[PDB]
Every structure is written in structure tokens, then in C-alpha cells.
């Protein structure tokens, strides 16, 4: 998992440059979490190594096995500079060699990852969905005055490559995701973008789940307790798993909400689906409230269990 | 259920903030 970033005394020009190759649709192959990252790193902490290798960001992806390796050019103007020599990279610099690139003003490292964070709030339902939710959210900004994209990001060819860079990156994602969640006053303007759309990516695709675990809970004067009937021998199996699934979850800590977009490792076992006697008690208990848990088809055969919570929810 | 305060329960045994076998048992 080596991640190599670029190190020149012109990283502005370096950096727009592999904006402006993704922008083109070029592919970066194994380059292109280093060329993210890179830019990351500007947005940023100004390329000074020693404020990134202290920040949560680093230690986080260290704490996930990334190795970061170094390409130390000083005196080089374009990315096409610092490809390493390979065989390997002809034809991303055959592609480079060739590449439109104006001048470009500092707004837009930020207000590429600005873009890059609309597609986060529905990434994991797949490119249509994606791309439609941050469109209708690049309506919001923009007649909010935060911003205007250049109108050629907006057709659905662009949107598709930005989408499958972000689903390619999982160093980008969690860039967003962590920015996201520890802004107060932001680095600059394009950061409460970011902010926003990670706000509504919170529990994507762990929402339901979320809302059985949620209605099986009870509460007591001995504190908060799983619902009675979770507790008998039928749900056992169910129970040790879900909490198994849980627990895995958990370990993502602060970036669980977002563990699914992030593909988080150990969630496989977070479907609703598996726990169907839960899902009958959590409905039972939530139509006593009256929630209908959206999602959760209760099966025919658990029908009287969920009867059962419903009835005693009540009572 | 009451409250509408377990979704900060809920959500913590999530994010480990509610240690899990406290509810779930060891």
C-alpha cells in the first residue's frame, strides 16, 4: 500500500496540472491515490511534511497501512516531470504530453475537492444516483453564491469520470470525510461545502440497520437494556451475530457513520436482512411510537413475534 | 423506548462510544 507523493518548489502548477488530467478522463493508474493525496496535502498543510505527519489524516491512514514514498524534484514546472521512468507510465505520459492546461488560480485545488464531496452523500447506490444528488446540490451552492463550477463539470460525461475517481479512492474519500467532520471555520471558503455534503453522508447505507439496533433498545431505572424477547433462545444466533457485526463496525470509531462508503472492513454482516426476528421486534416496537420502519419487511412467519413487541411496547 | 435519546445511544455503541457487552453481554 505505497502512496507516493510528488515534492517540487512548484506544487501549484504540479498540483492544477493533475487536476486538469483528471478532469480529462486520463488514467493515473497506480499514480493516482499519490496525485490525490499530493493535492490534498495543499489544500491543506502547503506541502510542509512535518505539519501533514503530525495531523489526524496521516495517522489515520498509517493506522490503516498506507506508506508514504517521496518523489523529491525541485527545479521541475510539469507533472509530466516527476513520472517516475517506467515502461509502465508510456502511455499516461504519452497522454500527458498532449494535455490542455491554463494558468491556474489556487481557489481550485479547494474547489475541486468542493466537487469531488457532492458525490458522497449517495456514492454507494451507484453512478445515476450519485450524480443526480449532487447535481441538484450544485443548484443549492450556486444560488447560494458559495460557487460556481465551471459549467462544463456539469454534464453527466464529466460527473461519470469524478464519480469513478471517487469510488477508485479511498484516500480522497476519507480526505472529505475527515475535513468534513472536524470543520468549525474551515481551511478556506470550498471547505462548509464539504462539511455539508459529508453531513449528509452520515449512516449512508447503514441507516436501516441503524433503526432496528435503535428500536430494540429499552430503556430502564437499571440502565439502557436490549428489549426482553431479543433475550430468549430463538434470537440467540441472531443476537451474537448482530453484535459480532456490530462490534466490527465500532472499530471504526468516529468514521463508522461512514463505513460503508468508505468500505470499511468488516461490515458484510450489517444487512437487515440476516437478523429477521430482530427486524420483527424493532417494527413491533416502532409501530407502538408509531414509526414505519421504511426498509424493513417483516416476513410472514415472524409476524407474531413482531405482534408480540407491538402489543407489549403498549403495554 | 422513549426519548428519542437512543439515537445518541444507538449511534454510540456505533461508534464506540457505549461499550457493547454492556448491552449486548459478554
Not at chain 1, 242 to 260: C, D, I, T, V
Not at chain 2, 2 to 25: A, C, H, N, R
Request: aromatic letters at 8%.
Amino acid at each position: 500500500k505505497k502512496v507516493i507523493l510528488f515534492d517540487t518548489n512548484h506544487q501549484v502548477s504540479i498540483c492544477n496540472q493533475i487536476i486538469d488530467a483528471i478532469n480529462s478522463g486520463i488514467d493515473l493508474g497506480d499514480l493516482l491515490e499519490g496525485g490525490l493525496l499530493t493535492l490534498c496535502v495543499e489544500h491543506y498543510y502547503n506541502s510542509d511534511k512535518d505539519k501533514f505527519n503530525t495531523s489526524p489524516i496521516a495517522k489515520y491512514l498509517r493506522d490503516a497501512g498506507y506508506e508514504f514514498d517521496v518523489i523529491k524534484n525541485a527545479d521541475a514546472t510539469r507533472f509530466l516531470d516527476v513520472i517516475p521512468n517506467e515502461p509502465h507510465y508510456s502511455p499516461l505520459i504519452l497522454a500527458l504530453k498532449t494535455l490542455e492546461s491554463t494558468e491556474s488560480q489556487r481557489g481550485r485545488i479547494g474547489l475541486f475537492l468542493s466537487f469531488c464531496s457532492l458525490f458522497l452523500p449517495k456514492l454507494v447506490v451507484g453512478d445515476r444516483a450519485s450524480i443526480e444528488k449532487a447535481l441538484r446540490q450544485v443548484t443549492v451552492h450556486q444560488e447560494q453564491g458559495i460557487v460556481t463550477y465551471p459549467n462544463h463539470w456539469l454534464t453527466t460525461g464529466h460527473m461519470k469520470v469524478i464519480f469513478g475517481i471517487l469510488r477508485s479512492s479511498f484516500i480522497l474519500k476519507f480526505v472529505l470525510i475527515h475535513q468534513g467532520v472536524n470543520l468549525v471555520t474551515g481551511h478556506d471558503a470550498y471547505d462548509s461545502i464539504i462539511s455539508n455534503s459529508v453531513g449528509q453522508t452520515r449512516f449512508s447505507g447503514l441507516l436501516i440497520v441503524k433503526t432496528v439496533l435503535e428500536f430494540i433498545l429499552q430503556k430502564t431505572d437499571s440502565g439502557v437494556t436490549l428489549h426482553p424477547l431479543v433475550r430468549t433462545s430463538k434470537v440467540k444466533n441472531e443476537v451474537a451475530s448482530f453484535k459480532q457485526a456490530l462490534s466490527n463496525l465500532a472499530r471504526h470509531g468516529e468514521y463508522a457513520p461512514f463505513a460503508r462508503v468508505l468500505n470499511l472492513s468488516g461490515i458484510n454482516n450489517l444487512e437487515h436482512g440476516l437478523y429477521p426476528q430482530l427486524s420483527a421486534i424493532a417494527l413491533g416496537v416502532a409501530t407502538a411510537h408509531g414509526s414505519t420502519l421504511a426498509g424493513v419487511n417483516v416476513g410472514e412467519q415472524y409476524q407474531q413475534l413482531r405482534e408480540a413487541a407491538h402489543d407489549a411496547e403498549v403495554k | 423506548w422513549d426519548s428519542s435519546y437512543m439515537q445518541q445511544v444507538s449511534e454510540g455503541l456505533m461508534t464506540g462510544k457505549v461499550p457493547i457487552d454492556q448491552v449486548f453481554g459478554a
